[PDB]
Amino acid sequence: GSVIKKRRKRMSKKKHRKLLRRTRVQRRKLG
Amino acid sequence: PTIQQLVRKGRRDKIAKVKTAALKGSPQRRGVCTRVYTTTPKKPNSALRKVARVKLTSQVEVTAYIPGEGHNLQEHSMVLVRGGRVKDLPGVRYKIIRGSLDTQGVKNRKQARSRYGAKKEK
Amino acid sequence: TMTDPIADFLTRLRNANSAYHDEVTLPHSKLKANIAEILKREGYISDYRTEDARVGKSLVVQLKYGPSRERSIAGLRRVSKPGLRVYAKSTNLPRVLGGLGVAIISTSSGLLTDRQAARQGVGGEVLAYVW
Amino acid sequence: ARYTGPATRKSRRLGVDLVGGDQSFEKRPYPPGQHGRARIKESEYRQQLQEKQKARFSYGVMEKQFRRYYEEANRQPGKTGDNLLRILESRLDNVVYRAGLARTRRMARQLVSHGHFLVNGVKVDIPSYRVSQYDIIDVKEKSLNTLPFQIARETAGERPIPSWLQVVGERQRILVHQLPERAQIDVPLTEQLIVELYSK
Amino acid sequence: NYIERVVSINRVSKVVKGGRRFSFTALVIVGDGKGMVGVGYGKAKEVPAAIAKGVEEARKNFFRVPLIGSTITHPVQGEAAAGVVMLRPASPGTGVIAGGAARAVLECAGVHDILAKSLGSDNAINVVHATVAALKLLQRPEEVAARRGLPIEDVAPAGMLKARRESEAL
RNA sequence: AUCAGCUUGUUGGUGGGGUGAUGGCCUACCAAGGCGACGACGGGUAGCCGGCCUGAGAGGGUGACCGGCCACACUGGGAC
RNA sequence: GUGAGGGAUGACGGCCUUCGGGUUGUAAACCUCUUUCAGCACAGACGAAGCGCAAGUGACGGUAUGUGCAGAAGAAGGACCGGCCAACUACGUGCCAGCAGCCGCGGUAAUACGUAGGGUCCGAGCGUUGUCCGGAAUUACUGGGCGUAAAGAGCUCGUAGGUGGUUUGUCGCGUUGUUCGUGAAAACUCACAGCUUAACUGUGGGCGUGCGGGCGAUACGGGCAGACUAGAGUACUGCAG
RNA sequence: AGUAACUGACGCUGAGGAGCGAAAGCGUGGGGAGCGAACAGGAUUAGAUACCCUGGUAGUCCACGCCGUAAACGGUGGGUA
RNA sequence: UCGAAGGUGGGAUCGGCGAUUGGGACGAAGUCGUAACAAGGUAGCCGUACCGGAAGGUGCGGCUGGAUCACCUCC
């Protein structure tokens, strides 16, 4: 299989992890 | 799968996507023209498509396409809307019926008149 | 483990047939001997016999090939299997190859073919198809 | 309704003559219109549709009635082709025309519709009337001396009467022995194409 | 008299430094309508030439279909590449019921009444190959009786024997 | 199951009561059961069927007319 | 039902043109014929072996129908024509106006837009929208798959469940045969009959794929009571890591 | 593996469930030579939050526990003929 | 006694709005960079951790779904 699919999945995962890191304290305080 | 797997879980059919959810099970709906304007199609084509914003009786705000050459629609105009997709416009799934309620049949049409609400010449 | 001896017998027959073997040996049981009898009487195999093995008895089956080395069996399928078993009434007996094949049916009168069962008006379990 | 427009149009389009003695079709055997000479593309659907149009324009039967006939013929325990052909041939107007009492099928239909005939002793004016075994079709006495029947009864030298019918009286009685079989029908075209078309 | 069926014409191309070089491939069926059919696949720079090569190749490879009167002997299922075509005999007067490629092959082979369905790989070449593979799986009842060394009545149903009698009478 | 626990006249017995009739149907006392992943308890939706439409068939959708049963009669209780 | 037969080096007009001519087109005009259904006049029901011991009694209805009269006389539209998918040209416009179910067509020479000729399909209908099934084997019981296309849990142990070697006897649960009861009528299907035909209506079979009771069989599955050692495990003797 | 002495179908799979499960990471307490995220300079570059160089903290190691993921791949579930 | 409706109370559950705020999809031509595909010019990817305007960089373990290995003298 082409690595293009892995690249799309990894970019989605990386962006989501960045978003989670950017709002850790906000999530902790709202939950 | 195994027959036992089938008798344990069975087969679940694919779900059906509801089309033209604003009509609510009716062939047509009556609406009022929220705003009447023009807009441009997708990139491969180019024109000034005539599109109206209609508030239906199902309390759904819907954008509808006006077929034919010329139209006389303005604000607060009662129109009768039907289902139909326009490939160029991204999210337009409805068309205004010509010759019904306020919207008028087009002028000087002699072929496919019934599709544009033009009466036969006397 | 071994679940279907009948299916194993049918697959031994099929594998030997595809490889043009003239002989196939398998452990013996009454059911296997009876379907072997039906196969021989219907002309699908040459002949069969039972020797004695180290523990029990064996089944020896001779495969029939034509003069030009063409197989006398075109297919062997197991219909009723452990798990999903198949029973047919005397009126809805299956047809194999539009009647050109033979369907073995286990009735209370013994092992019969589809035509024999239809003539005698009995039903049972559809063991296999031969064509 | 009925088809009323020109007749040779259909014959020219379908490539065969349906009336039988039409000189215009012989003069120009090609489709009508400006582009009647343009070469056509070959397609099985086109041939099947043309066969069906041939059948339903020879007998003057509209599409819905023809589909009803096809369903009836398929339902019957014969075979579809000759069953459909025999259902078509049993219509009263076709019987009248095939008995030599009408030069063309159109005038046979016109005569039947005007109540000039009388089947089994009861007046019948329905061209789609189907005719069974041992039916006696008579002309009512009032119309015996009319011009059409006069010229029909003194030119009995045209197309031969098929076996399954028999004009028996000097008053031109019609007796039906049995419904025709495929051998005696003597019709153009091919029924198998119609069966293929309606199975699509 | 030989009937022919050009079932598909495709414009293929190979790339070169200058550009694209287009040729034509035609799949042609040749038969006599009496029980023999042939399949040809010719390629040339021009459509009529490719059709000619397909016709000659189809004529070279001939194969006899075991018809019984007007239909095939028994139901069969043939698979070639990813194409699956099932065949089923039908009572007289039913007509040919098949898709375009299968219909062409069967009409060329002389089959009049048959139920045929395509069950995969809509590609015309592979559908034709699968139809031919199915037709090659048919067995004449006499050969079946010969294989099992039995009289023709003990092997075939009486309906087939009656059908053969009527066909040979006609 | 992105609804896992539910039930205290609730599960059973005895004596009474009640009813056209059997029966926690009601009652006093006694015992602690009963149901549930073979999905109880919740949430959503729905009158059910002969049939009807589609399909090669299996199956899918549906319950208009006609015919059977059910439920209701402004909303909620109640008896005569 | 809106007509039928005959009717030409094939009228006019329209349209195209290679300017020759071709198509509308046997179509029309004209000459005969018939009048269905409409229109007018006359007669006029069955439904009622009914109801009533009164003399009469039909809402539909003076309807259906029948017979006369006159005259082709009063009676055709809709969609589509790039491919799927029957059916092509001209003019106008030019990335506009627009079309479109998909592919996609509009860039002054568009068979895809608009209009006219021509054509095709249907026809008192013809198209559009909405909803369901089919095509879709695209939830695959019939009838699909999982190395790389979506799809083998990271790997084991094990609970409920599913499934199970050879053989003897027995049961008759499943399975199978037959019989009885039931499966309303209607519907569906076959045949026949009545409406002038058909739709429709009636009659007689089948169907009602099922369930319940009796009787028969025991090959297979299962239960019960045994037996065997080829699976599985233990014992003993060695062995490699 | 061999002998086959023993039992006599005691087998297979297994929803859920339980256990084990690289590295990184987390907690408590030790240890810390080398390597080395982060971090510092140097260089290259138009710019270098990099590649290269010099340093270098967590970590890597041990004890006891968490975590429960991987290209945990033969991208190939288990049993049998 | 039971008992509809009504009243009081504390919770369940389903939705709408919400100042502000997060990401997603699409958009010929805007700005910043070159990350991947040819060894893509530091092989790529997987889990994890840290860091950075951004693609991304680096450590640890793993995978090949990674390219090239000329000449190579004795026989």
| Cβ contact, residue pair E96, D195, below 8 Å | no
**Cα B95 from chain centroid?**
3
Question: Considering its fold, how many domains does chain B have in total?
Answer: 1
Please tell me whether residues D75 and D146 are part of one structural domain: no
Range of the domain at C50: 1-73
Cβ-Cβ contacts under 8 Å, C83 against chain B: 2-4
- Tally Cβ neighbours within 10 Å of residue E125: 19
Please tell me whether residues D112 and D102 are part of one structural domain: yes
Q: Please indicate if any CB of chain E lies within 8 Å of the CB of D182.
A: no
Is strand H in 7 Å reach of the CB of A13? no
DSSP helix/strand/coil, C32: helix
**Cα D128 from chain centroid?**
11
Please tell me whether residues C2 and C62 are part of one structural domain: yes
Please give the C-alpha separations between residue D175 and each of D31, D158, D171, in angstroms, as whole numbers. 40, 19, 12
CA dihedral D43, D44, D45, D46 (to 10 degrees): 60
| Cβ contact, residue pair C72, E74, below 8 Å | no
Cβ-Cβ contacts under 8 Å, E94 against chain D: 79-80, 195
Question: At what angle are helices D63-75 and D80-89 packed, to 10 degrees?
Answer: 130
Q: Please indicate if any CB of chain D lies within 8 Å of the CB of E115.
A: no
Residue in the structure block whose two tokens are 């020879």: D58
Yes or no: say if E110 and E67 are a contact pair by the CB < 8 Å rule: yes
Please give the C-alpha separations between residue D132 and each of C93, D61, D120, D176, in angstroms, as whole numbers. 41, 19, 11, 7
Yes or no: say if D56 and D63 are a contact pair by the CB < 8 Å rule: yes
Please tell me whether residues C87 and C59 are part of one structural domain: no
Please tell me whether residues D83 and D103 are part of one structural domain: no
Q: Which nucleotide is nearest to D105 (CA to C1')?
A: G4
Q: Domain with D66 in it: what CATH number?
A: 1.10.1050.10
Yes or no: say if D47 and D93 are a contact pair by the CB < 8 Å rule: no
| Cβ contact, residue pair C43, E75, below 8 Å | no
C-alpha span between B68 and B104 (Å, rounded): 10
Is strand H in 7 Å reach of the CB of C100? no
Yes or no: say if D89 and E102 are a contact pair by the CB < 8 Å rule: no
C-alpha span between C108 and B111 (Å, rounded): 76
Exposed/middle/buried for residue D8 (C-beta within 10 Å: 0-12, 13-18, 19+): middle
Cβ-Cβ contacts under 8 Å, D81 against chain E: 93
- Tally Cβ neighbours within 10 Å of residue C9: 23
Please tell me whether residues C13 and C52 are part of one structural domain: yes
Q: Domain with B116 in it: what CATH number?
A: 2.40.50.140
Is strand H in 7 Å reach of the CB of A6? yes
Question: Considering its fold, how many domains does chain D have in total?
Answer: 2
Please tell me whether residues C54 and C4 are part of one structural domain: yes
* The token pair that represents B31 in the structure block: 């609406």
Q: What is the number of alpha carbons within 13 Å of residue E31 lying toward its C-beta?
A: 23
Range of the domain at D83: 1-91+186-200
Please tell me whether residues C97 and C58 are part of one structural domain: no
Question: At what angle are helices D44-58 and D63-75 packed, to 10 degrees?
Answer: 100
Yes or no: say if C126 and C79 are a contact pair by the CB < 8 Å rule: yes
Pick from E91, E95, E100: which is nearest to D196 by CB? E95
Question: Considering its fold, how many domains does chain C have in total?
Answer: 2
Please tell me whether residues C1 and C61 are part of one structural domain: yes
Indicate left, alpha or beta for D100 from its phi (over 0: left) and psi (-120 to 50: alpha): left
CA dihedral E109, E111, E112, E116 (to 10 degrees): -110
Yes or no: say if E54 and E28 are a contact pair by the CB < 8 Å rule: yes
Please give the C-alpha separations between residue C81 and each of B39, C123, C125, in angstroms, as whole numbers. 66, 17, 10
Yes or no: say if E4 and E27 are a contact pair by the CB < 8 Å rule: no
Please tell me whether residues D176 and D117 are part of one structural domain: yes
Last residue of a domain, one of C73, C98, C117: C73
Q: How long is the CA D149 to C1' G113 vector, in angstroms?
A: 57
Is strand H in 7 Å reach of the CB of C18? no
Last residue of a domain, one of C41, C57, C73: C73
Name the resolution in angstroms: 2.9
H-type helices in chain D, by residue range? 8-14, 23-27, 44-58, 63-75, 80-89, 92-98, 105-113, 147-153, 182-185, 191-198
Please tell me whether residues D114 and D86 are part of one structural domain: no
| Cβ contact, residue pair E89, C99, below 8 Å | no
Range of the domain at B21: 1-122
Beta bridge mates, C25: C60
| Cβ contact, residue pair E73, C72, below 8 Å | no
Please give the C-alpha separations between residue C7 and each of C10, C13, D45, in angstroms, as whole numbers. 5, 10, 49
DSSP D155-199: -TTSSPPPTTEEE-STT--EEE-SPPPHHHH--SS-HHHHHHHHT
- Which experimental technique did the depositors report for determining this structure? cryo-EM
Please tell me whether residues C115 and C128 are part of one structural domain: yes
H-type helices in E12-157, by residue range? 47-60, 100-109, 124-135, 141-148, 152-155
Please tell me whether residues C69 and C89 are part of one structural domain: no
DSSP helix/strand/coil, C74: coil
Beta bridge mates, D118: D123, D138
C-alpha span between D33 and E162 (Å, rounded): 53
Is strand H in 7 Å reach of the CB of C12? yes
Beta bridge mates, B15: none
Please tell me whether residues C98 and C84 are part of one structural domain: yes
Please give the C-alpha separations between residue C48 and each of C16, C35, C59, C117, in angstroms, as whole numbers. 14, 11, 7, 24
The minimum CA-CA distance between E73 and chain C, rounded to whole Å, is: 8
Q: Do chains C and E touch, with touching meaning 3 or more CB–CB pairs less than 8 Å apart?
A: yes
DSSP helix/strand/coil, E88: strand
Measuring alpha carbon to C1', the residue closest to nucleotide I22 is A19
Please tell me whether residues C65 and C88 are part of one structural domain: no
- Tally Cβ neighbours within 10 Å of residue E70: 19
Cβ-Cβ contacts under 8 Å, B3 against chain C: 83-84
Please tell me whether residues D167 and D196 are part of one structural domain: no
Residue in the structure block whose two tokens are 């559809």: C126
- Cβ neighbours for C50, distance < 8 A, ≥ 6 positions apart: C28, C33, C57, C58, C59, C60
DSSP helix/strand/coil, B28: strand
Instruction: Give the per-residue SS3 of E120-146.
Output: CCCCHHHHHHHHHHHHCCCCCHHHHHH
Q: Domain with C101 in it: what CATH number?
A: 3.30.1490.10
Q: Which residue, among C4, C84, C85, C86, would best test binding to B if mutated, counting the most B CBs under 10 Å from its CB?
A: C84
| Cβ contact, residue pair D196, E92, below 8 Å | no
Please tell me whether residues C53 and C78 are part of one structural domain: no
* The token pair that represents B110 in the structure block: 């002699």
Look at strands C47-49 and E63-64 and give their pairing: unpaired
Pick from E139, E146, E149: which is nearest to C100 by CB? E139
Please tell me whether residues C43 and C90 are part of one structural domain: no
Look at strands B61-65 and B94-96 and give their pairing: parallel
φ, ψ for residue D7 (rounded to 5)? -90, -40
- Cβ neighbours for C4, distance < 8 A, ≥ 6 positions apart: C78, C81, C82
* The token pair that represents E166 in the structure block: 């009527």
Look at strands D174-176 and D136-139 and give their pairing: antiparallel
Last residue of a domain, one of C23, C45, C73: C73
* The token pair that represents B102 in the structure block: 């306020």
- Cβ neighbours for B92, distance < 8 A, ≥ 6 positions apart: B51, B63, B64, B65, B85, B86
Nearest CA in chain C to B5: C83
The minimum CA-CA distance between C84 and chain B, rounded to whole Å, is: 7
Q: Please indicate if any CB of chain B lies within 8 Å of the CB of C84.
A: yes
What is chain B's length? 122
Q: Give just the sign of the alpha carbon dihedral D6, D8, D14, D16.
A: positive
Please tell me whether residues D96 and D33 are part of one structural domain: no
- Tally Cβ neighbours within 10 Å of residue C28: 18
Angle, CA C128 vertex, CA C125 and CA C129 arms, to 5°: 130
Yes or no: say if E73 and E141 are a contact pair by the CB < 8 Å rule: yes
